[PDB]
């Protein structure tokens, strides 16, 4: 072991390095304390002919352009043309780069942490919603098994069906089970007065989904803008829409946060919406029958003082060709006039009274 006795000197040199890094590593806090302004960064690779070529183009907020090479600490997500970077007083170095995404009108579209309703509020849809509950639970907790089996979850799910079916509140009810950040988005929000806004809205959605933590982005009324016209505004929605499809077709690192979509009608079905990353999950959600409407109305009305003498035959007969949110409006209306009816217990005539009241 006489040859291995020189390792002690090496360990003393290494622990001496750990003892001497406290000062030069300690000045990091006083030199990198606070970047006082914000400057935009534009990446431009240079060539010196070590003597290697590496530079970048800087733009300050006060419209002043300067010169500086790519410097700072170890960069992994950096080197992108972004803003909100660290800079000292006048030397103009890059110390702390953080993405900005400002235009809060699109950033703070729907800031929802988590909803209140859950998946246990409906009745008679487990045979078709269980695939979605799996498709949102197993891709969140079973990422470890995705390498043993080589499975990549789909990013486009088509939640299509007739309107008024409560698909929005049901997908949100599953978003409560996702436990991630819920972010709504409306179809008619892409159509703006100025040009090129849809690119900023789409790249903003993938800026918060790509940049931010694992979240949930549910959109609705996509059929209202998914028109395949052959000037025209829906062709501009073909520029923004086909741009989004290009970001769901040309991006292999799109294994991040999913994009859930729902269409209230399948009359104008875009044929280009068929792909593993695109809207491949096509589970048909028809109009619930009087049995299913009595189920979702019973579980949605399990909190009010409902009379126990309900055979569901009269309401099952009156509810003809109705939808989910319509029976939800009947439940809410019954909870509205049942107060002024004097009797605190919900009666049986209030069902047809609400049906003929709002419809």
């Amino acid at each position: 072991k006489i040859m291995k006795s020189e390792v002690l000197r090496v360990t003393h040199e290494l622990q001496a390095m750990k003892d001497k890094i406290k000062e030069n590593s300690e000045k990091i806090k006083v030199n990198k304390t606070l970047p006082y302004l914000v400057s935009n960064v534009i990446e431009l690779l240079d060539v010196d002919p070590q003597r290697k070529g590496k530079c970048a183009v800087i733009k300050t907020s006060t419209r002043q352009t300067y010169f500086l090479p790519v410097i700072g600490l170890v960069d992994a997500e950096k080197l992108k043309p972004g803003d909100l970077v660290g800079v000292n007083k006048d030397s103009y170095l890059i110390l702390e780069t953080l993405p900005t995404e400002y235009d809060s009108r699109v950033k703070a579209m729907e800031v929802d942490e988590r909803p209140t309703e859950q998946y246990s509020d409906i009745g008679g849809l487990d045979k078709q919603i269980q695939e979605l509950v799996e498709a949102i639970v197993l891709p969140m907790n079973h990422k470890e098994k995705f390498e043993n089996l080589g499975i990549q979850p789909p990013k486009g799910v088509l939640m299509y069906g007739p309107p008024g079916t409560g698909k929005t509140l049901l997908a949100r009810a599953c978003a409560a089970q996702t436990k991630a950040t819920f972010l709504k988005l409306a179809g008619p929000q892409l159509v703006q007065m100025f040009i090129g806004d849809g690119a900023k809205l789409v790249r903003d959605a993938f800026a918060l989904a790509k940049e931010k933590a694992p979240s949930i982005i549910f959109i609705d009324e996509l059929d209202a803008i998914g028109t395949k016209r052959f000037k025209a505004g829906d062709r501009e929605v073909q520029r923004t829409m086909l741009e989004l499809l290009n970001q769901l077709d040309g991006f292999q690192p799109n294994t991040q946060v999913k994009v859930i979509a729902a269409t209230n009608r399948v009359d104008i079905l875009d044929p280009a919406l068929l792909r593993s990353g695109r809207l491949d999950r096509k589970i048909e959600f028809p109009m619930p029958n009087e049995e299913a409407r009595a189920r979702i109305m019973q579980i949605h009305s399990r909190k009010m003082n409902v009379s126990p003498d309900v055979n569901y035959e009269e309401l099952a007969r009156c509810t003809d060709d109705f939808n989910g949110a319509q029976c939800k409006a009947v439940c809410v209306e019954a909870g509205m006039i049942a107060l002024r009816r004097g009797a605190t217990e919900l009666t049986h005539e209030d069902y047809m009274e609400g049906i003929l009241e709002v419809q």
Partner: protein, 58 residues
């Protein structure tokens, strides 16, 4: 309550150290310390002059 007529003696040591320190006189605020000996009331002589490491506070 008394005052005299003082005059600061400047040799080439402090001068050249303020010239190298002026070459290192970046826009960032810098610090330095002057040394010397006090022989009487109305004279002051500087001999030793060094620089100080910069800081974000200045």
């Amino acid at each position: 309550a008394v005052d005299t007529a003082e005059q600061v003696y400047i040799s080439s040591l402090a001068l050249l150290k303020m010239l190298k320190h002026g070459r290192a006189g970046v826009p960032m605020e810098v610090m330095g310390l002057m040394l010397g000996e006090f022989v009487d009331d109305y004279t002051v002589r500087v001999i030793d002059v060094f620089a100080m490491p910069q800081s974000g506070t200045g």
